[PDB]
């Protein structure tokens with residue numbers, strides 16, 4: 001099939017800024033009839049995609065002139081001359097020239113804001129969960145920016161990823177930050193076998209990891 | 220009145236079948252090609268099928284021999300009959316009008332429906348276990364508390380704090396599928412001067428199982 005590659009995956013912008021999203025196809029998008037069916041869609045949260053530009057440069061009805069499309073053959077570009085609040089969402093290019101029509105992976109237009117270190121909280125397993133034979137240690141990493149963060153769990157100085165569930169929130173419409181939850185689930189047996197549980201976060205805001213630890217012996 | 224409305228989505232076990240419908244209004248349905256497009260949980264968009272105004276049919280290779288598209292031009296309804304469903308067929312299915320008629324030099328998706336959710340899973344409805352998350356009390360101006368909503372199915376679950384009276388400083392994380400069951404967590408941050416003094420409770424609702432749990436977050440040593 002024709003692979004549509006979009007770059008970047010996430011694009012941080014400030015309102016008023018100009019923005020460009022690239023879409024490249026693995027093969028020519030020119031159809032046998034001579035036309036290029038390269039379209040661009042914008043999808044906002046909880047909404048269906050909406051057409052913005054069709055056949056490379058034609059703006060669809062009701063789309064503001066701030067949106068422009070260009071390119072040829074295998075390289076296309078979506079340009080937003082001035083980003084408004086209502087432009088935030090995921091942009092997708094699409095080629096409908098060859099069967100099967102394919103979509104690019106999407107480009108998230110996000111709000112750029114100052115770097116913020118995560119506020120990390122760690123929670124020991126509740127007494128109620130232990131009763132059912134389970135043990136989940138929870139780590140919340142809240143209000144940080146940018147979204148790129150690596151969290152590692154260490155049990156008595158040794159890394160463990162098995163049994164870990166990670167989830168990220170979308171950008172907060174209030175402070176434009178991101179938040180993350182990381183849950184390490186072990187059997188009650190395993191949990192009472194170790195003493196130190198560490199949630200370790202690597203974020204560009206610090207040269208050393210942000211560490212929050214819970215030592216059972218200190219309870 | 221140009222609108223597309225999909226229906227028929229829901230839960231089905233792998234190998235099962237389901238029929239989606241897409242009702243069209245506001246335009247002469249018969250003069251346009253129509254298409255079904257799906258969006259995976261990972262948000263990847265994938266074209267499934269296109270049926271032209273003249274009836275020419277084009278399928279994504281992976282659904283060929285499993286899906287059957289059809290249209291009723293009298294009732295302005297587009298159907299998608301899915302059979303031999305796989306886990307990877309789990310997605311939000313959108314019908315879309317294609318601005319094309321047989322022989323036209325233009326074609327593009329100009330109108331989309333709201334979508335209908337399809338979930339292919341062997342899992343059965345399972346109420347959640349709700350656990351309070353409180354800091355070790357022996358361990359700042361603000362305190363973060365939370366609730367862990369573990370091992371439920373299917374989506375969704377709703378989480379509020381103090382029956383909604385506590386809306387600021389709350390983060391509810393998207394559910395993550397683990398071993399066929401979903402787990403979700405929620406955190407709430409409040410001034411240290413209010414907790415434990417004031418009570419904080421998380422309310423969890425899971426409609427699928429009529430579950431409504433209120434879990435008070437009480438201080439405790441670990």
Ligand SMILES: CCNC(=O)N(CCCN(C)C)[P@](=O)(Cc1ccc(NC(=O)C(F)(F)F)cc1)O[C@H](c1ccc([N+](=O)[O-])cc1)[C@@H](CO)NC(=O)C(Cl)Cl
Nearest residue numbers: 032096097099101252269270271275317319321322323326
């Ligand atoms: C074997 C028969 N040959 C063909 O089929 N084609 C010629 C292939 C030539 N190469 C092998 C060199 P093809 O290009 C294949 C094709 C099909 C769908 C789409 N896109 C979408 O479906 C959407 F998702 F992008 F919209 C893109 C290409 O058909 C075109 C087409 C476009 C749109 C629709 N529609 O919307 O339903 C139907 C058909 C067009 C000829 O052009 N046909 C017609 O108008 C006939 Cl008279 Cl109906």
